[PDB]
Amino acid sequence: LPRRIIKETQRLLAEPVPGIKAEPDESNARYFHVVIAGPQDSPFEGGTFKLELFLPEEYPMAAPKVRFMTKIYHPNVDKLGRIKLDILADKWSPALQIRTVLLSIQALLSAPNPDDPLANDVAEQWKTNEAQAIETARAWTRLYAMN
Amino acid sequence: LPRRIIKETQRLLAEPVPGIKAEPDESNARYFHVVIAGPQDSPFEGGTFKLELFLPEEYPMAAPKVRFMTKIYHPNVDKLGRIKLDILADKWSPALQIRTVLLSIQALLSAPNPDDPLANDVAEQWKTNEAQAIETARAWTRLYAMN
Amino acid sequence: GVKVPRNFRLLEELEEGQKGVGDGTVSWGLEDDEDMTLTRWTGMIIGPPRTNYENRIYSLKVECGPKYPEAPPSVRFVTKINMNGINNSSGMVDARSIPVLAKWQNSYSIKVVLQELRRLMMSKENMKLPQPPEGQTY
Amino acid sequence: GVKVPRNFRLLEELEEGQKGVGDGTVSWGLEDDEDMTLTRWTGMIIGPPRTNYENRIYSLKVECGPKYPEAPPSVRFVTKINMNGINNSSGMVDARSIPVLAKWQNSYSIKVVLQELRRLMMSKENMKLPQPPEGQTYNN
Amino acid sequence: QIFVKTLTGKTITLEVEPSDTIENVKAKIQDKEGIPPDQQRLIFAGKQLEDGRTLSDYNIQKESTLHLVLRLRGG
Amino acid sequence: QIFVKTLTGKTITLEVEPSDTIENVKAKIQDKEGIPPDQQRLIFAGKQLEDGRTLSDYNIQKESTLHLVLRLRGG
Amino acid sequence: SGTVSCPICMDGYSEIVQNGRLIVSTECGHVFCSQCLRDSLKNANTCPTCRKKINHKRYHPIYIGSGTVSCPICMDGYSEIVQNGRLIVSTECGHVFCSQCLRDSLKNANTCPTCRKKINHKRYHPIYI
Ligand SMILES: [Zn+2]
Ligand SMILES: [Zn+2]
Ligand SMILES: [Zn+2]
Ligand SMILES: [Zn+2]
Numbered sequence: 001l002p003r004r005i006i007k008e009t010q011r012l013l014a015e016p017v018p019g020i021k022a023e024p025d026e027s028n029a030r031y032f033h034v035v036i037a038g039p040q041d042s043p044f045e046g047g048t049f050k051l052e053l054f055l056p057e058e059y060p061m062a063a064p065k066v067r068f069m070t071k072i073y074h075p076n077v078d079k080l081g082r083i084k085l086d087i088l089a090d091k092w093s094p095a096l097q098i099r100t101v102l103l104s105i106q107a108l109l110s111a112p113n114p115d116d117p118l119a120n121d122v123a124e125q126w127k128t129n130e131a132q133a134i135e136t137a138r139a140w141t142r143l144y145a146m147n
Numbered sequence: 148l149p150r151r152i153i154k155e156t157q158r159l160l161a162e163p164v165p166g167i168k169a170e171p172d173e174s175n176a177r178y179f180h181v182v183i184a185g186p187q188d189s190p191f192e193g194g195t196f197k198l199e200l201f202l203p204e205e206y207p208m209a210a211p212k213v214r215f216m217t218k219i220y221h222p223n224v225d226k227l228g229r230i231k232l233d234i235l236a237d238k239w240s241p242a243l244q245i246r247t248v249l250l251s252i253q254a255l256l257s258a259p260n261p262d263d264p265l266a267n268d269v270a271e272q273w274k275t276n277e278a279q280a281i282e283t284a285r286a287w288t289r290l291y292a293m294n
Numbered sequence: 295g296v297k298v299p300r301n302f303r304l305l306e307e308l309e310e311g312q313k314g315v316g317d318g319t320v321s322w323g324l325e326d327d328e329d330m331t332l333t334r335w336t337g338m339i340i341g342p343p344r345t346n347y348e349n350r351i352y353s354l355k356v357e358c359g360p361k362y363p364e365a366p367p368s369v370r371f372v373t374k375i376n377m378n379g380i381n382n383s384s385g386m387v388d389a390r391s392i393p394v395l396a397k398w399q400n401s402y403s404i405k406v407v408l409q410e411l412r413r414l415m416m417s418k419e420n421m422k423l424p425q426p427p428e429g430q431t432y
Numbered sequence: 433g434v435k436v437p438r439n440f441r442l443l444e445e446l447e448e449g450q451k452g453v454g455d456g457t458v459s460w461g462l463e464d465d466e467d468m469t470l471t472r473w474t475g476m477i478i479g480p481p482r483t484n485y486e487n488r489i490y491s492l493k494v495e496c497g498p499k500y501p502e503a504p505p506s507v508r509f510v511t512k513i514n515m516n517g518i519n520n521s522s523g524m525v526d527a528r529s530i531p532v533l534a535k536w537q538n539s540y541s542i543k544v545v546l547q548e549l550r551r552l553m554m555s556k557e558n559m560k561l562p563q564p565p566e567g568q569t570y571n572n
Numbered sequence: 573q574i575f576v577k578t579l580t581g582k583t584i585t586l587e588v589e590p591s592d593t594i595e596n597v598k599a600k601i602q603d604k605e606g607i608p609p610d611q612q613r614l615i616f617a618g619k620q621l622e623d624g625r626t627l628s629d630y631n632i633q634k635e636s637t638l639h640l641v642l643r644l645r646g647g
Numbered sequence: 648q649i650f651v652k653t654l655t656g657k658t659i660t661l662e663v664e665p666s667d668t669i670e671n672v673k674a675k676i677q678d679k680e681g682i683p684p685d686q687q688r689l690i691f692a693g694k695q696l697e698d699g700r701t702l703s704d705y706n707i708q709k710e711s712t713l714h715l716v717l718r719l720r721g722g
Numbered sequence: 723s724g725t726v727s728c729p730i731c732m733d734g735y736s737e738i739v740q741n742g743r744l745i746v747s748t749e750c751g752h753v754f755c756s757q758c759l760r761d762s763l764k765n766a767n768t769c770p771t772c773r774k775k776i777n778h779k780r781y782h783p784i785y786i787g788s789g790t791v792s793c794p795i796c797m798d799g800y801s802e803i804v805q806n807g808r809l810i811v812s813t814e815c816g817h818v819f820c821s822q823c824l825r826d827s828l829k830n831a832n833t834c835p836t837c838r839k840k841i842n843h844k845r846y847h848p849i850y851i
Binding site for chain 5: 171184185186187188189232234238240242243246247251254255256258259262264288291
Binding site for chain 7: 605
């Protein structure tokens with residue numbers, strides 16, 4: 001197991017970034033349960049969102065794999081919790097390490113972009129009727145992210 | 148004084164090289180009284196030789212100046228103690244430090260080159276009659292370097 | 295060495311399924327798109343040539359246990375079929391009957407399983423069996 | 433700022449001496465080649481033209497103290513000469529008599545000293561003095 | 573094991589057999605610090621070590637300390 | 648004039664001449680409703696219409712009616 | 723072997739940047755503080771450390787955050803890397819890495835992992851700190 005993994009974990013453990021919780025699984029070190037507090041003054045805010053992070057052995061060569069385990073309303077997160085963030089795909093560079101990624105996700109909620117977001121339907125509403133969409137997001141948060 | 152000079156001085160004080168002894172002068176910091184033990188299986192060997200080192204301001208830029216204060220029989224060292232070593236003239240690199248030079252001179256004792264030489268008379272003797280020269284060198288050591 | 299959590303492994307399977315594979319004679323994919331747990335899956339087998347199965351489509355249902363892929367997944371046909379290992383009443387496959395299910399390895403994937411079944415249809419004991427009229431189910 | 437130690441300084445001079453300088457009317461060098469301490473220098477001056485000195489050759493002994501170049505060096509003629517500042521008995525030069533020796537500075541070197549002496553020979557008070565017959569020497 | 577003290581005065585440690593040629597060692601130094609061996613001169617007991625000979629030849633042993641200077645011709 | 652239609656509901660009416668390219672047409676739709684030209688897939692007469700060709704080319708004429716299907720995105 | 727310094731004037735890293743100098747490195751891998759190397763270049767045209775003939779613009783600045791060095795990719799410290807027999811390396815963009823990680827980072831993309839500047843096998847060389 002590469003030294004790096006521990007360290008990153010360790011500082012993660014030793015120090016926690018605000019608005020986030022990251023617990024490694026006991027069975028496997030490379031696997032993580034992460035809980036993200038919704039951005040303040042975001043419709044999500046007040047909700048808590050589960051994610052799971054895993055890193056292929058190839059990491060950092062290979063970007064980590066991240067997914068939402070909590071159902072959430074957003075253009076860039078699909079029905080299965082799959083996130084479309086570019087730093088996970090094309091833009092991935094080894095230096096970045098998890099801690100960063102996580103914050104990057106935190107931002108995304110705050111800053112929804114319709115940029116080939118997978119869910120055009122989410123996209124469609126968000127461009128057409130942002131007000132509505134935002135309301136729906138809050139709804140789902142209530143429904144799913146309050147427990 | 149330039150920092151480097153101090154470190155070098157300070158560094159010399161901190162950790163002695165063996166068979167090489169170097170004490171700065173009281174009146175001038177940039178001036179040094181130095182003692183070199185003759186290298187092993189030299190004719191000089193088990194000998195003690197006084198040298199004096201001064202460094203011009205431009206140093207490191209300008210090479211240090213070194214001279215023998217002890218009379219010694221060698222092709223490169225003339226009658227007045229003037230050493231003809233190339234790193235003191237042409238090949239001077241600022242990266243070289245006093246401690247290095249010193250060892251270089253010590254080394255030079257082991258390997259005299261009369262191929263081209265300063266003290267021509269000796270050189271002639273050394274190429275023509277190495278055996279003799281070596282003996283004379285030991286002689287002079289006895290005569291001059293044992294006190 | 296390297297342990298791959300279920301869900302991520304399931305995703306890996308899913309992505310490959312969508313891509314489709316090779317001949318495309320067998321295919322898999324998810325039963326319901328709103329399921330986060332990726333448990334309920336649908337499979338398709340195409341009946342191998344020059345056997346009573348040939349030129350026929352069989353749909354399967356596959357469930358993936360919490361300890362998938364460590365434990366093998368439960369499988370059953372939805373289209374009617376006569377076959378060794380395949381319970382006729384239920385269209386459920388007895389684990390032990392089938393070598394891969396019996397000998398399950400965490401490495402095996404659904405894809406493997408289906409080929410397995412497809413492969414198995416061609417075997418002499420099966421290829422001979424009479425089959426029902428097209429399009430009945432349990 | 434930067435103060436040079438004696439020993440290296442003397443070599444500088446020495447080298448310059450061997451190179452020779454200017455019109456070669458003054459010349460200096462170690463009295464002996466075996467002395468590491470560089471204590472004693474021989475100097476030589478040529479008597480300047482149009483003076484009783486002209487076309488005469490004067491040898492000097494110069495001693496260089498441990499204190500030098502801060503302190504001025506001691507200077508003597510070996511060749512006999514009539515000249516102000518020059519002690520007639522001993523052929524020694526009184527420090528104070530001569531401006532450079534009196535007003536000495538580290539920057540000054542044997543070369544300058546000699547030149548000074550040469551120039552001085554040309555001064556009125558000196559130039560007309562009659563000289564002893566060529567080739568006499570003070571005792572020593 | 574052998575301690576070579578570099579140009580800057582830092583000690584670096586090497587792994588070797590007394591059989592090893594000087595030339596061979598110089599390569600190991602080049603590797604660590606990036607000086608071509610032509611340019612390296614190696615000193616022990618106030619003596620410059622020559623390429624063809626072995627560490628054993630000069631009776632350098634386990635944990636002996638080596639001093640490195642720049643190739644000089646003198647002259 | 649011609650009418651363009653959706654899976655959705657809305658009928659949109661355009662002003663075009665038979666020379667007009669398919670690309671050209673898609674732009675007009677893009678302008679009215681905000682869907683980019685590469686997203687749009689357009690169907691008439693049991694055929695998918697291609698960019699280089701003209702309306703005359705497909706013999707669409709008389710205030711004919713067209714169906715718009717939009718690509719779902721799954722990058 | 724420890725915090726970086728410039729072997730000419732013998733300052734530490736802090737001390738070097740503190741007074742508005744750069745840290746830079748030759749094409750031969752030897753590191754210096756930019757003043758000192760410029761001044762050396764004033765008198766000859768050879769690496770002060772190995773004598774390589776550089777003749778200008780065969781050097782560039784490098785960037786390192788702490789003064790001690792560590793490859794950001796694998797997250798190793800100097801000792802660890804060396805003892806493994808790997809090399810410390812810099813891109814021409816001034817960005818530093820252990821040889822191994824970088825080698826492998828190129829196998830996928832041809833861009834620097836810190837900044838993105840285009841690169842290839844040629845464009846990086848070892849440094850000896
Ligand atoms: Zn410097
Ligand atoms: Zn170099
Ligand atoms: Zn690395
Ligand atoms: Zn870069």
